[PDB]
Amino acid sequence: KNLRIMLKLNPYAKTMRRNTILRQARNHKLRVERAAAALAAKSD
Amino acid sequence: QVLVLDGRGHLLGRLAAIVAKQVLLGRKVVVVRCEGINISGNFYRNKLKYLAFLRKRMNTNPSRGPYHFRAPSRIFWRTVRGMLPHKTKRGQAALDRLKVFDGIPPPYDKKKRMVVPAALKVVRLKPTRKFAYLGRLAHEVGWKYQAVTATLEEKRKEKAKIHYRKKKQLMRLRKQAEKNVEKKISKFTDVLKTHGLLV
Amino acid sequence: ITPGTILIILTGRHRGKRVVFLKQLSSGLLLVTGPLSLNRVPLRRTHQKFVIATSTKIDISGVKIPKHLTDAYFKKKKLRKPEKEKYEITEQRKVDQKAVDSQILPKIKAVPQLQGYLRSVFALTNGVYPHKLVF
Amino acid sequence: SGRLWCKAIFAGYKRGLRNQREHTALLKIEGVYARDETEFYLGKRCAYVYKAKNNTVTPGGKPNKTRVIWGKVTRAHGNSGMVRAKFRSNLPAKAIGHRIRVMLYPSRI
Amino acid sequence: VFRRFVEVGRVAYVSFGPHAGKLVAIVDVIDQNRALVDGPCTRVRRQAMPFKCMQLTDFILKFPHSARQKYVRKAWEKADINTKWAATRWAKKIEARERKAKMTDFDRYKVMKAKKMRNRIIKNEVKKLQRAALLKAS
Amino acid sequence: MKASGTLREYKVVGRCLPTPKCRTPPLYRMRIFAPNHVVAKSRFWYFVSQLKKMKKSSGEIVYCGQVFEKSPLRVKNFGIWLRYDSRSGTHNMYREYRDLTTAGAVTQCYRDMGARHRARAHSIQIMKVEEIAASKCRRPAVKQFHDSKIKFPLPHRVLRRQHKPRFTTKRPNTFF
RNA sequence: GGGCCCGGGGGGCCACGCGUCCCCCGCGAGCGCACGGGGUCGGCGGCGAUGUCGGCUACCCACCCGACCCGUCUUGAAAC
RNA sequence: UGGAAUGCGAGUGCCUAGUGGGCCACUUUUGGUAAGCAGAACUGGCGCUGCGGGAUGAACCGAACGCCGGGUUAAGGCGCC
RNA sequence: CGGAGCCUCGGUUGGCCUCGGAUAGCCGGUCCCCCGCCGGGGUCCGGUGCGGAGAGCCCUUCGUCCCGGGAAACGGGGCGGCCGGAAAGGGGGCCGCCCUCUCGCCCGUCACGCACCGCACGUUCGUGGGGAACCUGGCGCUAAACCAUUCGUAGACGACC
Ligand SMILES: [Mg+2]
Numbered sequence A: 001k002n003l004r005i006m007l008k009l010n011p012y013a014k015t016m017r018r019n020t021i022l023r024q025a026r027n028h029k030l031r032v033e034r035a036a037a038a039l040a041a042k043s044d
Numbered sequence B: 001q002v003l004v005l006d007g008r009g010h011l012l013g014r015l016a017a018i019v020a021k022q023v024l025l026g027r028k029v030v031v032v033r034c035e036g037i038n039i040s041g042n043f044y045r046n047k048l049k050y051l052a053f054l055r056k057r058m059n060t061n062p063s064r065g066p067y068h069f070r071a072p073s074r075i076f077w078r079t080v081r082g083m084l085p086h087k088t089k090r091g092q093a094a095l096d097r098l099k100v101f102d103g104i105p106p107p108y109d110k111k112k113r114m115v116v117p118a119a120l121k122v123v124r125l126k127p128t129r130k131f132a133y134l135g136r137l138a139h140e141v142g143w144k145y146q147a148v149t150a151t152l153e154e155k156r157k158e159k160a161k162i163h164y165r166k167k168k169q170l171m172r173l174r175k176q177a178e179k180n181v182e183k184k185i186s187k188f189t190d191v192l193k194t195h196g197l198l199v
Numbered sequence C: 001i002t003p004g005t006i007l008i009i010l011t012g013r014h015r016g017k018r019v020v021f022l023k024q025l026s027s028g029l030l031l032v033t034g035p036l037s038l039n040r041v042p043l044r045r046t047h048q049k050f051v052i053a054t055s056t057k058i059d060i061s062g063v064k065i066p067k068h069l070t071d072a073y074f075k076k077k078k079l080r081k082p083e084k085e086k087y088e089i090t091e092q093r094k095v096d097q098k099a100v101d102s103q104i105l106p107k108i109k110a111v112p113q114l115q116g117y118l119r120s121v122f123a124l125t126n127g128v129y130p131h132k133l134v135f
Numbered sequence D: 001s002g003r004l005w006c007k008a009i010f011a012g013y014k015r016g017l018r019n020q021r022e023h024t025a026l027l028k029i030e031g032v033y034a035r036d037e038t039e040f041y042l043g044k045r046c047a048y049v050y051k052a053k054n055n056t057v058t059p060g061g062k063p064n065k066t067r068v069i070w071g072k073v074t075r076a077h078g079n080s081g082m083v084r085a086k087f088r089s090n091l092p093a094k095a096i097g098h099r100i101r102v103m104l105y106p107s108r109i
Numbered sequence E: 001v002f003r004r005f006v007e008v009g010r011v012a013y014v015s016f017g018p019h020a021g022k023l024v025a026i027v028d029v030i031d032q033n034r035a036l037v038d039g040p041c042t043r044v045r046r047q048a049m050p051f052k053c054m055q056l057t058d059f060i061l062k063f064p065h066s067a068r069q070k071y072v073r074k075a076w077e078k079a080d081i082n083t084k085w086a087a088t089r090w091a092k093k094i095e096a097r098e099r100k101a102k103m104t105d106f107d108r109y110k111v112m113k114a115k116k117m118r119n120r121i122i123k124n125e126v127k128k129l130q131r132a133a134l135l136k137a138s
Numbered sequence F: 001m002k003a004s005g006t007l008r009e010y011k012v013v014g015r016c017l018p019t020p021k022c023r024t025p026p027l028y029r030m031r032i033f034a035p036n037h038v039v040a041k042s043r044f045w046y047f048v049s050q051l052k053k054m055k056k057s058s059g060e061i062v063y064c065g066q067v068f069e070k071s072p073l074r075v076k077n078f079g080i081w082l083r084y085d086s087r088s089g090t091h092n093m094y095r096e097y098r099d100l101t102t103a104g105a106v107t108q109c110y111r112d113m114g115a116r117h118r119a120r121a122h123s124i125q126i127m128k129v130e131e132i133a134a135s136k137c138r139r140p141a142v143k144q145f146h147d148s149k150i151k152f153p154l155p156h157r158v159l160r161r162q163h164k165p166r167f168t169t170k171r172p173n174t175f176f
Numbered sequence G: 001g002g003g004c005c006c007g008g009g010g011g012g013c014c015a016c017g018c019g020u021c022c023c024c025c026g027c028g029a030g031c032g033c034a035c036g037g038g039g040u041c042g043g044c045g046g047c048g049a050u051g052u053c054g055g056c057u058a059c060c061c062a063c064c065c066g067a068c069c070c071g072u073c074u075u076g077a078a079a080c
Numbered sequence H: 001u002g003g004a005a006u007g008c009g010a011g012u013g014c015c016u017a018g019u020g021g022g023c024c025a026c027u028u029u030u031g032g033u034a035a036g037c038a039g040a041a042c043u044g045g046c047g048c049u050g051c052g053g054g055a056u057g058a059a060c061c062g063a064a065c066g067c068c069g070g071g072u073u074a075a076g077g078c079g080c081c
Numbered sequence I: 001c002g003g004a005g006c007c008u009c010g011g012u013u014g015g016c017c018u019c020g021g022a023u024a025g026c027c028g029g030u031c032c033c034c035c036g037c038c039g040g041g042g043u044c045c046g047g048u049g050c051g052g053a054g055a056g057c058c059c060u061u062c063g064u065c066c067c068g069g070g071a072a073a074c075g076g077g078g079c080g081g082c083c084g085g086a087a088a089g090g091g092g093g094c095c096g097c098c099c100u101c102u103c104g105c106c107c108g109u110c111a112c113g114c115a116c117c118g119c120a121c122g123u124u125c126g127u128g129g130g131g132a133a134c135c136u137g138g139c140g141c142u143a144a145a146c147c148a149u150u151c152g153u154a155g156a157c158g159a160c161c
């Protein structure tokens, strides 16, 4: 639960969490663009 | 203030269970037409049940109890008492929040009656099951005012029929009036329909 | 709670009254106005936990709230007793009330039946349950 | 002017069948008959309000016979909408079956 | 005495469950309690549904029992069940039910004012119709 | 085994542990219906032990995986061959059900065996489950639904919202 | 797939001095924010001298839940 | 290469009270028609022990107890009491 | 029957003024047709996941000022008479009046009120129930019970005649 307590025990946890956040946000951005294109494709 | 219930077409124990919990939360309850209450099972096996109760008596002094009340109202009352902690002040206070009546005497004859769909016989019984009438059962264990209560209940229904016809009359005028003033109230009729009050 | 939102006050002498939310002060308390002429609620601070934010909103984006209307402006001044000491509405507050009201009031009257809505108090009645109804 | 509080009933204390925890009161709120509807009322103030013989000071007023025990809703109880409440003092057993005011604050809406 | 029958093609309103408020068509009957239903034009996948959570409407589409979703949709569109449903009083009463539920505090104020004035106008007219009826009695 | 919730159909493959006598013992497969895969493997060892000189200690599970219903959107008639112990004997039954999944039909068999014969799941052995054509069904309960123009009403619809409201002014209507 | 994710021809690295020999091919300074070795406010409001404020416990009363009379011998006592 | 796993600090000596009526249960078991009978084995109980559940109850089921707050459970339950 | 207050007791914090009932069936119009002392059946027409719906209905309270638009004009407020109610009986409606108002409702115009400087027991039912008293006016009443005595249809004594 406490972030800075984790980094005291496992500094690498900050890297993993930053990567997860950046990856998950990037994967979300693809699904919307994929979905948006499909919706636009259907309108055609 | 007061929750008035109509006992006709209610099963004895399901009505008592709901009524008992209600007066324990501090609500006043009136149950009218206790003779109209029902019990599941054929009449005969329910008559045998009350005759078995009737045999319970202090062998050394029957006057000391149990007291076998014969009125359908008192039978129901004792049944609600059996679902309350009546030997404590809290239960006795609740038991005083309940009134029980055979027929519908004033002032409840001219007040609207609520029902309990979780105790209605049409809901809780399979239609092919037999059932007893509390009034008939009470009449056949020593109740004396079955014929009078029916006589007075027929007078009430005749008066209630005239009241209903007056209300239907005042409703036919109400519908006509809405047509006459339709032009003047059209704007206010749009507000109500916009928000679901009128369909 | 966005500026222009109508809030229902829940405590104090102004409880039940519907007021217009102007801004959130630096202390975190909200600033609201009745306006005074509609429900006799002046420029007054209120705490957000003690208001219900309705869904009705007027657009007060063009209203210029005086900048001296701060937490220190609305902080109570102590009055001494030895009989009784009475609070007085400083002439500055009256001037500030008119300046802000003159901009909000015309925008309230733009919405039909809204000025009357702000005159009317909120109350629970028979069969009305807060968890069921939308504000 | 008008009512600003919801109507509740002091149904009883927290308990098993033969043990009673008087520090928690079970409240029944009018119109709340399922557990998913109790969410609005969690954390809201509750007041057992009563009258006594002797006068007592009234905040923002002059002494009168009204007294109040404050509390608040802490969590839901059961499936049918009962909530648990806690008061600054254990409620008196004479309050069972009587009105408990539930205020609309602390507002979360 | 019975007017609505559980049959192939009957359109049923779903009253409760994960699909409450939607229309489905009876595609097939599994047993006394369950039916195969389909909602191709109402966002319901083909699945089993009990009759308990179903309310039969008056529409009966014409497709063979257990026909695939292509033909259930085709019959749904030809009958225009979606627009016919919205024209029924049953659908309108549902719409009124939700309009009232979402009413805002300001909406409730405006209804009270409109209702206040509308009821006074009607009552005054009823009084006049009663008085007029009196003169005929005399 | 407790027939908890809706059963799943598992394909369990096992064999004797290889030994110098037989480096490649033959593979055995069973159809298992169980709540979870942990129960599924347990019942396998209970069945093969009754048919072979094998048990968990001298054998292993090679594959445990759920068999998915192949036509979950098509109504089928299932014949079930089972044996069970009553209070005073063992019996072989043949039973039929209509369902969309074969594991759903098997679950109905456990509830039905419990309802009509007070047979606990631990005393029931499902021997075989087949999909049966309408013309080969035997039980009239299943055959009455083999009607292309089947129709029927819903008489005497009981009020199930009996506590919402708990008190009302109008009495319920059961005809729709 | 594994080989500091081998060798050759848009995005993150707890790489980032250098003289080299060559495998291979020992102290920078400050400043600041904090999910950081257990709560603080550098935040506020009401009321008060003859009827009001606080007083666990204690005196009396009420209510809800609990609750059989002790000592003893006894396998076993509220014990007829 | 302290030569299987796992866990745990061990060894040793004086003085010593009460007890030396027991009883109960799963399983095994003798006599007896059987017994809330008499008599054994094993383990666990009650005795010495409250507490939740079995309405009530020495022994059943759960669980063992410093004085408290919050949370969650066991065995059992959730018409009303 | 028609003033200030003082004790004490509590709870409560809008009202629903009513067909009968059926549930494998219901509800409302429709008198054109048939019966009866305006009511019942038929026809016909509408509703029926009840909308002539308790998932409902009614009332809704910030107040006052000025002037407009809709709504009222058969209207709002106020002393005299006759039907009417008995299961545990109506401070309902109707007719007169001499009075008393053009305001009550809705949409606007126009300002004002302790705006008590964020905060609880607020807001009614409430001229609430019971108790002492104090007044201050009118119209009215002027008893019985028990003891004692007597009786003996009664009796242990009480009680009873
Ligand atoms: Mg007799």
Ligand SMILES: [Mg+2]
Binding pocket: none
């Ligand atoms: Mg009060």
Ligand SMILES: [Mg+2]
Binding pocket: none
């Ligand atoms: Mg007790």
Ligand SMILES: [Mg+2]
Binding pocket: G072, G073
């Ligand atoms: Mg002794």
Ligand SMILES: [Mg+2]
Binding pocket: none
């Ligand atoms: Mg002995």
Ligand SMILES: [Mg+2]
Binding pocket: G077
């Ligand atoms: Mg003893």
Ligand SMILES: [Mg+2]
Binding pocket: G079, G080
């Ligand atoms: Mg004894």
Ligand SMILES: [Mg+2]
Binding pocket: none
């Ligand atoms: Mg023995």
Ligand SMILES: [Mg+2]
Binding pocket: none
């Ligand atoms: Mg001993």
Ligand SMILES: [Mg+2]
Binding pocket: none
């Ligand atoms: Mg021990």
Ligand SMILES: [Mg+2]
Binding pocket: H049
């Ligand atoms: Mg123990």
Ligand SMILES: [Mg+2]
Binding pocket: none
């Ligand atoms: Mg027992």
Ligand SMILES: [Mg+2]
Binding pocket: none
């Ligand atoms: Mg605890």
Ligand SMILES: [Mg+2]
Binding pocket: none
């Ligand atoms: Mg129990």
